[PDB]
Paper text:
We also present structures of AvaR1, in isolation (2.4 Å resolution), in complex with avenolide (2.0 Å resolution), and bound to a synthetic DNA oligonucleotide (3.09 Å resolution) derived from its natural binding site. The overall structure is reminiscent of that of other TetR-family transcriptional repressors, and consists of an obligate homodimer. Each monomer is entirely helical and consists of a DNA-binding domain (DBD; composed of α helices 1–4), and a ligand-binding domain (LBD; consisting of α helices 5–13). The dimer interface is formed via interactions between the two LBDs and is formed mainly through hydrophobic packing interactions.
Co-crystallization efforts for AvaR1 bound to avenolide yielded crystals that diffracted to 2.0 Å resolution, and crystallographic phases were determined using molecular replacement (Thorn and Sheldrick, 2013). Clear density for the entire hormone can be visualized bound to the LBD of both monomers in the homodimer. Notably, the structure of AvaR1 undergoes conformational shifting upon ligand binding, and a structure-based superposition against the ligand-free structure illustrates that binding of the hormone results in an ~10o shift in the DBD of each monomer. This shift results in an increase in the distance between the two DBD in the dimer upon binding of the ligand, which would preclude DNA binding by the ligand-bound homodimer. Additional local changes between the two structures included the movement of Gln165, which swings into the binding pocket to make hydrogen-bonding interactions with the lactone ring, as well with Gln64. Last, Thr108, which is harbored on helix α6, also moves to accommodate interactions with the hormone. The indole side chain of Trp127 likewise shifts to increase the volume of the binding cavity. Other interactions include hydrogen bonds between Thr131 and the C10 hydroxy, and an interaction between Thr162 and the lactone ring of avenolide. The superimposition suggests that the new contacts formed by these residues are likely to couple hormone binding to the conformational shift between the two monomers of AvaR1. Specifically, movement of Gln64 and Thr108 into the ligand-binding cavity of AvaR1 upon engagement of the hormone results in the displacement of helix α6 away from the pocket.
Residue numbers in the entry:
A (entry chain E): 0 to 217
B (entry chain A): 7 to 217
Amino acid sequence: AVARQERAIRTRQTILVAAAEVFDEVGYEAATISDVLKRSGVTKGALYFHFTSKQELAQAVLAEQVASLPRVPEQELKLQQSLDEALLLAHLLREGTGDPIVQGSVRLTVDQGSPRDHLNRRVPMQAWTEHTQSLFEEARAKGEILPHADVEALAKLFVGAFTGVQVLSRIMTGRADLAERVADLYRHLMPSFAMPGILVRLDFSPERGSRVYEAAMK
Amino acid sequence: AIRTRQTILVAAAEVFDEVGYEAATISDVLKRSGVTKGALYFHFTSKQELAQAVLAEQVASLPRVPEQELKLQQSLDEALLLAHLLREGTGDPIVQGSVRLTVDQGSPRDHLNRRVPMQAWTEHTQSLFEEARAKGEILPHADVEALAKLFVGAFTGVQVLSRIMTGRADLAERVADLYRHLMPSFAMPGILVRLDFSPERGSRVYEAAMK
Ligand SMILES: CC[C@@](C)(O)C(=O)CCCC[C@H]1C=CC(=O)O1
Ligand SMILES: CC[C@@](C)(O)C(=O)CCCC[C@H]1C=CC(=O)O1
């Protein structure tokens, strides 16, 4: 029983990682259960214990998007935390290795599909919006945000802007410039709402990005 | 014949919007455009060539906003116009489908070059920011290329989020938020206050652009 549940945990992750990969490579519609079976090396029995259909598997990779980012060390500035997360996500989307679910999950999110596929792409977008607003809320309690800033509007701006920065970067450089583009984004958004005292202390450097990455990989 | 090429282009874009590139067919396009097989094949050899042309026509499809002395306003006018056109469709029936073709990842096997509209938007936005900079609307040494990339990128994402969350119902608000929040990082003194974000202005811009 104890061993059965440990196997169940590991098997689900194995499926999710393999499924995200095939969804990344070929998209939702062209992907098959067979592709995922070939990639994971799990049995057909194992896959159906965890997921009911391709659709429900796709939904799960969508739903695990936010939970996929390694949690950054809890720190002094909440807006530095947001920057650290965004730059880590930029690294994870270019490299893939540190989190093999995100690339595929983002592709499923951003591909339009149709109402016919019954995928709920709002799921990860809502979760990122909540994630981001929550961090702004904590930043505001810690005196990091200007008075009368709309933290919901701001959260929606950050999620949307990040998404499109990602898209443009994917198209133009295959995400090679993504960390630089994300840094640029944060440098031009933060001045509208971050307390000036916080703004001078924020660290946008690839060296800090590198250290956060090295830390998150344990 | 040029108008027949456009009728086909509009129909192809709408078909690409509805069902995507892979699922779409010449037969869908012919049904939608109501042109003969001969008319289509004179202008395009394949679905692939059709897709490349609606991708290519993206920037040019955007109706020209009236020239403005405040160049930042001109950009805002364009941004809010494009928001409006992406939400409704009727004033630029090409753009919805062209955007889906740009944003959908597809595969390197499809021979579609998504770089073409993105490069064109970047050069367009860069030119405006050069004019803005020279007229003293933005910081004299602002990296106008990086800003263009930032604006094209951020707009695309705001668009994508709005489509997913509201079907683009909130797009104009979200684009306004984008411009309002990016501007203080690089605008010259007294410029941000001069900008007009109102939907009444947006409406006047829309009308003039169609005329
Ligand atoms: C702004 C930075 C951060 C960490 O707080 C996010 O909310 C990340 C948003 C990621 C959204 C994801 C969905 C589509 C896409 O391209 O990326
Ligand atoms: C920033 C405002 C503007 C007018 O100057 C643009 O460049 C618009 C960029 C349009 C990009 C297009 C591709 C995907 C998408 O969602 O929209």
